[PDB]
Design a binder for these strands. Structure first.
Ligand SMILES: [Ba+2]
Length: 615
DNA sequence: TAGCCACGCCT
DNA sequence: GCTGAGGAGTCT
DNA sequence: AGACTCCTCTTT
DNA sequence: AGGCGTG
């Protein structure tokens, strides 16, 4: 462990995936050997590879490579990696567009000149398109350009794409069990370790649980490769959207929409369809559906609202993939029909079916009910009685609103510089709550985590723990997390409800002491300032409330994890607390948020929206 | 749709 | 658009 | 000269 | 004011 941080982290990944019997079925021998080859390198040889694996994939000037901590002179090390088959040298640098790319605009000028036919000025981009048109006609002069371009660029290494590929697939796999260590790190461009992972994994200590895998996710190394392909596609589409190239993204999508209807009969699907949901998210079909969702987003941006409706109706026609997404869809469907396609007939059928789908929850549920009333009680609609149709009167109860002012300067205010939220925490200090946290959902989530820790990492649920560095059972964000643990859950949620404020102070003390540091997705250790703070807070919150919140989180974290209030403020001595949703000059309450506030009131908790106006 | 935010537009 | 901080190279 | 784009390194 | 999009 004179291994620097980035190497320790890389090794954990390799180990974690290599000890999966199931995972190792999806690598041929050729592939498997490369890993051995890695392990065979010297410590130096390894350090340097990780560095370069992490760097962008392409050619690097030998003079641009400095790691003192690896060695003062890296030529030996490079030679090892070359011989090993991991790194290639300027010697294999053959493509012109590659040689040019590697050179600086300065150098590009020096070659634009010492070639008489070249206009020595313009951008770097131009001089390239130039030198490439020239070598394409008079080929024999092109080989002389390349000859110098090379000699001019210098000594240069590149990571070999082939072995690289194996490590990315390993990284990909590591990342399913770490939720998705990132779609951006693993799934796109190509796999590197996320920043946080690369830094911390080597030090991280995980909650103890029992690995118990009883089902395969992938049929064979082929299924993996098809999945990896869909993954990369979704990544490149998301990437396009991000860079605003909505035209490219529409193609890319349609492209993928073919391929998916191409796979729609293949043997493998039968088995995937059959997986429990918490695993079904790791299949081609799930990724293709996810892609089709982005596609309706794209149809929407390009304002093609008829198509988007078709696509939404397609997605909703099946319950196989992404059922957690139907709420987003039904809502999105209805919004399109009502707003954009003014078809008031379907808007109702839509809203009706949607609200009859036990799949839709919280925010979207509310948002459909709200459109219903706005619609039924509208004259532009009155010539009907098809929405009086027994709509359960989910009239989200009304909440105390409050307003304060702050001197404006994400929006920054002054009081020293601070946030909308910090400004309010102040108003509340002078309102006689000496104590507060700005924690949004993590305050509550880590309390749920502290109180149910042992039930979460409980033994006896097949398939939820598949390997070594999990921070949660894979079914955590499913309807099955609760069903698979009903009896234990009902029991614990009851105890908590009746617990007096010392049993709580004690249960928390317990987990805290036994688990402090351990990486669990629900628990932020620095979220409270000390164990003592946590105990204060639970004391104020009290069982019935602590129970109610925990019940929602475990029952349906997927759809309840967001829209809890920004602030918790309590009075130390008086034990009175308030749950505050800060609303700066430019944001209102989302449906998710008005559900939470309602539900927190029912639990009998002081809830308040605190509007901030600027000066 | 990951969720957030600031802005801007329409009604 | 954003989800971090600094430096080197490119652009106009 | 200054603005912006790209890339790397983070830690223990 | 609030519903909706855009980046
Ligand atoms: Ba807020």
């Amino acid at each position: 462990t004179g291994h620097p941080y980035y190497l320790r982290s890389f090794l954990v990944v390799l180990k974690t995936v290599l000890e999966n019997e199931d995972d190792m079925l999806l690598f041929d021998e050729q592939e498997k050997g490369i890993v051995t080859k890695f392990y065979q390198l010297s410590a130096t040889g390894q350090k340097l590879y990780v560095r370069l694996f992490q760097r962008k994939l392409s050619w690097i000037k030998m003079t641009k490579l400095e790691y003192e901590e690896i060695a003062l002179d890296l030529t030996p090390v490079i030679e090892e990696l070359t011989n090993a088959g991991f790194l290639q040298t300027e010697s294999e640098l053959q493509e012109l567009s590659e040689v040019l790319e590697l050179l600086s605009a300065p150098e590009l000028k020096s070659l634009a000149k010492t070639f008489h036919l070249a206009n020595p000025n313009g951008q770097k981009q131009q001089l390239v398109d130039a030198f490439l048109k020239l070598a394409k006609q008079r080929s024999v002069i092109g080989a002389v350009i390349l000859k110098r371009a090379k000699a001019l660029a210098g000594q240069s290494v590149r990571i070999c794409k082939g072995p690289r590929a194996v490590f990315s697939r390993i990284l990909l796999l590591f990342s399913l069990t770490d939720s998705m260590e990132d779609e951006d790190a693993a799934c796109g461009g190509q796999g590197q370790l996320s920043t946080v992972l690369l830094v911390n994994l080597g030090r991280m200590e995980f909650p103890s649980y029992t690995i118990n895998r009883k089902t395969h996710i992938f049929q064979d190394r082929d299924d993996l490769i098809r999945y990896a392909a869909a993954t990369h596609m979704l990544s490149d589409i998301s990437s396009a959207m991000a860079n605003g190239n909505w035209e490219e993204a529409k193609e890319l999508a349609q492209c993928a929409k073919r391929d998916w209807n191409r796979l729609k009969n293949h043997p493998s699907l039968r088995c995937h369809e059959d997986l429990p949901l918490f695993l079904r998210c790791f299949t081609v079909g799930w990724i293709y559906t996810r892609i089709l969702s982005r596609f309706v987003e794209i149809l929407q941006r390009l304002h093609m609202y008829e198509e988007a409706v078709r696509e939404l109706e397609s997605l909703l026609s099946q319950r196989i993939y992404c059922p957690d997404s139907r709420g987003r869809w039904w809502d999105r469907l209805a919004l399109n029909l009502h707003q954009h396609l003014k078809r008031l007939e379907p808007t109702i059928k839509c809203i009706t079916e949607g609200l009859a789908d036990p799949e839709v929850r919280t925010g979207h549920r509310l948002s459909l009910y709200q459109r219903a009333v706005r619609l039924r009680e509208s004259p532009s609609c009155k010539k009907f009685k098809h929405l009086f149709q027994q709509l359960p009167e989910m009239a989200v109860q009304d909440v105390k609103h409050v307003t304060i002012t702050g001197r404006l300067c994400k929006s920054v205010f002054v009081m020293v510089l601070c946030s909308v939220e910090e400004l309010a925490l102040a108003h509340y200090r002078r309102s006689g709550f000496d104590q507060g946290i700005h924690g949004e959902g993590s305050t509550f989530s880590t309390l749920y985590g502290l109180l149910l820790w042992d039930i979460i990492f409980m033994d006896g649920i097949p398939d939820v723990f598949r390997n070594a560095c999990q921070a949660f059972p894979l079914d955590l964000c499913t309807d099955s997390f609760f069903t698979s643990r009903r009896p234990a859950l009902e029991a614990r949620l009851q105890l908590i409800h009746d617990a007096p404020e010392e049993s709580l102070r004690a249960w928390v003390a317990a987990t805290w002491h036994e688990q402090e540091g351990r990486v669990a997705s629900l628990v932020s250790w620095d979220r409270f300032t000390s164990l003592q703070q946590a105990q204060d807070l639970v004391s104020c919150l009290g069982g019935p409330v602590l129970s109610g919140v925990c019940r929602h989180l475990a029952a349906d974290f997927r759809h309840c994890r967001g829209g809890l209030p920004d602030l918790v403020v309590w009075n130390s001595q008086s034990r009175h607390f308030k749950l505050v949703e800060v609303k700066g000059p430019n944001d209102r309450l989302s449906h998710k948020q008005m559900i939470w506030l309602a539900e927190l009131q029912k639990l009998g908790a002081e809830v308040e929206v605190c509007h901030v106006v600027a000066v």
